[PDB]
């Protein structure tokens, strides 16, 4: 199982793997801090390359509570 973010429920799903909790996005901190941003996967690698794009995974499963929100949470 792993994470997301999609808060509505919790955000731990996409089994499949095995794999990481990715979420990419666009703004992190002051344009949106407060939804979102963010979508997410189930991953299939976090590498190095980005513009100014937010990128995080993180191998586990969940990883992830930060759902956060405006503060969390």
Not at 1 to 26: E, L, R
Not at 34 to 56: E, H, N, Q, S
């Amino acid at each position: 199982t792993k994470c997301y973010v999609t808060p509505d429920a919790t955000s731990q799903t996409c089994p499949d793997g095995q794999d990481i909790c990715y979420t990419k996005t666009w703004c992190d901190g002051f344009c949106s801090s407060r939804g979102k941003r963010i979508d997410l996967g189930c991953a299939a690698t976090c590498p190095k390359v980005k513009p100014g794009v937010d990128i995080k995974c993180c191998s586990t499963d969940n990883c992830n509570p930060f759902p956060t929100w405006k503060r969390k949470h």
